[PDB]
């Protein structure tokens with residue numbers, strides 16, 4: 001059955017969006033809307049192996065106390081973003097493995113939804129063959145270790161419908177043990193329509209023994225900006241998409257989620273914009289305004 005059905009997704013009470021909505025003077029309808037919508041909580045190399053267990057236990061326990069399903073995104077892979085606007089990740093595979101162990105320790109047997117490494121498999125060809133193999137091994141390690149929490153619904157990130165082909169991505173998913181996870185994620189931090197992503201997801205599902213998927217609908221209400229380089233990097237004219245739900249239109253689509261947090265910058269984007277991940281109230285307002293709110 002769909003592990004995501006049956007309770008609301010957790011609204012993070014401490015998100016930058018909540019802080020902005022509470023501080024708004026006068027109150028702002030767009031910030032409030034965004035702030036009250038459940039998103040995902042992103043963890044990376046700022047949360048070292050030594051302590052991330054406690055961070056995870058705290059967040060999943062808080063979500064359980066709220067009667068809700070926490071969504072956590074892991075974004076610590078070595079050579080992350082191939083050193084572009086969202087550069088970072090742990091220094092080595094050894095560090096990354098210790099990080100995954102600590103995250104798993106914090107999960108215990110608690111309910112959680114885990115999005116594993118946005119872009120990692122899709123971007124892997126920027127690496128040398130040896131480094132690419134290591135990356136696949138690390139994503140497979142995440143799957144094998146995290147799924148030891150029976151109550152973790154694990155979705156390995158699989159890019160989007162205009163990145164790798166369904167066949168190419170399915171090969172990579174099968175290589176990293178997608179069969180042990182619940183499935184895969186699509187459209188993370190991107191803008192493609194839900195319909196387009198459903199067709200792509202059902203194709204990958206067909207090639208991965210019926211695996212299930214989630215789609216990031218945080219910013220896809222108006223589809224993507226015109227085809228261009230960096231059309232994914234703080235594009236204007238985009239809108240909030242469907243709020244998180246399990247009432248989807250795909251046979252193997254477990255949920256629409258907001259994985260990316262609306263309002264956060266995608267990077268400097270060659271325009272001196274705020275660093276990737278920094279909350280920009282104006283960006284959240286624009287996305288909400290464009291959706292008619």
Ligand SMILES: OC[C@H]1O[C@@H](O[C@H]2[C@H](O)[C@@H](O)[C@H](O)O[C@@H]2CO)[C@H](O)[C@@H](O)[C@@H]1O
Nearest residue numbers: 081084086119160162163188189190232
């Ligand atoms: O999808 C968000 C993700 O996009 C990355 O760029 C991709 C792009 O999405 C794809 O359409 C194009 O064909 O390939 C590039 C990479 O070569 C971007 O680099 C990431 O930061 C971002 O998270």
